[PDB]
From a paper:
In this study, we report the crystal structure of human GnRH1R in complex with the antagonist drug elagolix. For lipidic cubic phase (LCP) crystallization, an initial GnRH1R construct was generated by replacing the third intracellular loop (ICL3; amino acids [aa] 243–256) with the thermostable Pyrococcus abysi glycogen synthase (PGS) domain22. To further improve the homogeneity of the receptor, the point mutation P1283.39K (Ballesteros–Weinstein numbering used in superscript) was incorporated into the engineered construct and the position 3.39 mutants were previously shown to make receptors stable in an inactive state, and were also reported in other recently elucidated GPCR structures. Finally, GnRH1R (P1283.39K)-PGS was crystallized using the LCP method in the presence of elagolix and the structure was successfully determined at 2.8 Å resolution. The overall architecture of full-length GnRH1R consists of seven canonical transmembrane (TM) helices but lacks a cytoplasmic C-terminal helix (helix 8). In summary, the GnRH1R crystallized in complex with the antagonist drug elagolix represents an inactive conformation with respect to G protein coupling. In contrast to the previously reported structures of β-branch class A GPCRs, one interesting feature of GnRH1R on the extracellular side is that the N-terminal region (aa 18–33) before TM1 is well folded and inserted into the orthosteric binding cavity with clear electron density in the structure. The overall pocket in GnRH1R is defined by the N terminus, TM2, TM3, TM5, TM6, and TM7, forming a highly hydrophobic binding site. The pyrimidine ring, as the core of the ligand elagolix, sits above the aromatic side chain of Y2836.51 and forms a hydrophobic π–π interaction with each other. However, the oxygen atom at position 4 is engaged in binding with the side chains of residues K1213.32 and D982.61, forming only a polar interaction network in the elagolix binding site.
The central regulator of the HPG axis is gonadotrophin-releasing hormone (GnRH), a decapeptide neurohormone produced by mammalian hypothalamus neurons. The GnRH peptide can activate the GnRH receptor through the heterotrimeric Gq protein pathway. There are two isoforms of the GnRH peptide in humans, GnRH-I and GnRH-II, and their effects are exerted by activation of the classical GnRH1 receptor (GnRH1R), which belongs to the rhodopsin G protein-coupled receptor (GPCR) family. GnRH1R is expressed primarily on pituitary gonadotrope cells but also on lymphocytes and breast, ovary, and prostate cells, and has emerged as a promising therapeutic target for the treatment of conditions including infertility, uterine fibroids, endometriosis, and prostate cancer.
Author numbering: 18 to 65, 74 to 144, 152 to 183, 192 to 242, 1001 to 1196, 257 to 328
Write the structure that this text describes.
């Protein structure tokens, strides 16, 4: 009853505009074929690494899915009758699923290898072998379950092949998951990690944010700055952010300061808080600026050159944020030698280790107060190895080899192309599965369009490599 026309078209006859549309499909077939062909040749002529090893097998599955499904579904078997024989109906139904299982499992193997590469052997080729293995084993049943029926005219269908209704439901469910949904799952997850890396890497201009441009010794830099402002020398914490309520944490710091205000070791501490935003939060800071001469507040925005000034002079960066999935202030800061004190709320949770700063629970004014107190209790011993750890840790987060970087940006493009182009094709597939009478509500122009939109992905893959090839 509720099956899927995987090898059967839905046009009683061929309209003139149908013959126009098949010619237009022939175009996209030709763009795809000659391009993945000319990209395959580029690869062997460039063989006379592993990221090349995987692009060959992806492009090989691209060519294979283009040569099999574009003529089958787009040019030939588009009417409701099967014009070949029973043998070519079981072989072609096999090759159709085989070439699509293979294209997906290649995007899975690349998304998996590159997600690992952000942390030259045999494992490289055992992945793509498994990909061709699974995709050939998963398409096996299509040889037995498809048959040519002539009850009139002939068609290549699964009718009267499964017994119970559950035998067929689980088969088509298995086809959908292992064709699109499960790969999309594995892909989106692996490419989510690569997105975090790229954001950090392409987000720190290390050619600017580095300590080679500073002048002289670090404590000279601090004396000179602390009297530039107009306070005397002491342990220095700094905050630079938008004055926000429930967002960046300036209220937490301010209340933490007022806890630390009438205290025992408050006299040794300097605080430079910087930022503009809501107005009631500035009057709080600026009132602590008149009650205490070791609290400077700067709401005028500064120069790019003067932020690097401070990161490599202050003793600590207080980063009391509520939500910070990337953490670039902490990486600029650490790149210049400053020690971070931040709330474990995202990238700060991942960026600050045990020997690279002090993490605290977010949103608590106290506890931050005790962190600021722990930080000063460990300043009596001169922290030089402590600052080199942040310099090197933040260095790695912000820096990536050029070569491994283009393949990183490449993989994210491959995935987005697959996610974008194949999602409309396959949801109408699952939509049809739940309600077959949905087909009676869709154009021939839009059925044709979402067919072409899907095969934009495999013929633009070669374009994605070439683009990120400088
Ligand atoms: C496990 O399920 C699977 C597995 C693999 C592929 C398909 C698969 C998908 C996802 N779509 C997308 C699609 C629809 F489903 C329904 C409406 C519109 C579209 C559109 F996006 F194209 F607009 C296809 O069109 N075909 C083409 C398929 N006819 C095969 C013969 C060629 C033709 O029909 O001319 C078909 C047509 C209409 C309904 C169901 C199947 C597919 O085989 C599939 F359903
Ligand atoms: C847009 C269609 C496909 C998109 C694939 C995105 C993969 C999902 C991971 C999202 C991670 C994220 O933080 O997204 C934010 C990104 O900076 C958007 O500009």
């Amino acid at each position: 009853n509720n099956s899927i026309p995987l090898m059967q078209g839905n046009l009683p006859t061929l309209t003139l505009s149908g013959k126009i549309r098949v010619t237009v499909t022939f175009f996209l077939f030709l763009l795809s074929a000659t391009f993945n062909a000319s990209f395959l040749l580029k690869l062997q002529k460039w063989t006379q690494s592993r990221m090349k090893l995987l692009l060959k097998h992806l492009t090989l599955a691209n060519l294979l899915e283009t040569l099999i499904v574009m003529p089958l579904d787009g040019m030939w078997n588009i009417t409701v009758q099967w014009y070949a024989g029973e043998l070519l109906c079981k072989v072609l139904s096999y090759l159709k699923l085989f070439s699509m299982y293979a294209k997906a499992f290649m995007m899975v193997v690349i998304s998996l290898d590159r997600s690992l590469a952000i942390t030259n052997s045999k494992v490289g080729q055992s992945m793509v072998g498994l990909a061709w293995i699974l995709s050939s084993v998963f398409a096996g049943p299509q040889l037995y379950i498809f048959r040519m029926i002539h009850l009139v005219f002939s068609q290549c269908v699964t009718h009267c092949s499964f017994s119970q209704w559950w035998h067929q439901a689980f088969y088509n469910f298995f086809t959908f998951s292992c064709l699109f949904i499960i790969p999309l799952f594995i892909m989106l997850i692996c490419n989510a990690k690569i997105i975090f890396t790229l954001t950090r890497v392409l987000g720190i201009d290390c050619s600017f944010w580095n300590e080679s441009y500073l002048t002289g010794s670090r404590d000279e830099r601090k004396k000179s700055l602390l009297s530039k402002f107009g306070m005397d020398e002491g342990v220095t914490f700094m905050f630079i952010g938008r004055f926000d309520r429930g967002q960046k944490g300036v209220d937490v710091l301010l209340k933490a300061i007022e806890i630390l205000s009438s205290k025992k070791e408050f006299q040794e501490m300097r605080f430079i808080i910087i930022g503009k935003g809501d107005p009631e939060l500035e009057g709080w800071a600026r009132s602590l600026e008149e009650k205490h001469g070791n609290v400077k507040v700067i709401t005028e925005m500064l120069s790019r050159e003067f932020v690097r000034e401070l990161y490599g002079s202050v003793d600590f960066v207080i980063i009391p944020s509520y939500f910070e999935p990337f953490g670039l202030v902490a990486l600029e800061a650490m790149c210049l030698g400053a020690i971070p004190i931040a709330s474990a709320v995202g990238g700060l949770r991942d960026i600050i280790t045990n020997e690279t700063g002090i993490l605290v629970k977010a949103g608590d004014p106290g506890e931050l107060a005790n962190a600021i107190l722990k930080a000063l209790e460990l300043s009596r011993s001169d922290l030089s190895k402590f600052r080199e750890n942040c310099k090197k840790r933040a260095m790695s987060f912000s820096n990536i080899p050029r070569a491994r970087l283009k393949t990183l940006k490449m993989t994210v493009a491959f995935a987005t192309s697959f996610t974008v182009c194949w999602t409309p094709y396959y949801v109408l597939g699952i939509w049809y599965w739940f309600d077959p009478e949905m087909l009676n509500r869709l154009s021939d122009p839009v059925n044709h369009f979402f067919f072409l939109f899907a095969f934009l992905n495999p013929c633009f893959d070669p374009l994605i490599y070439g683009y990120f090839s400088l």
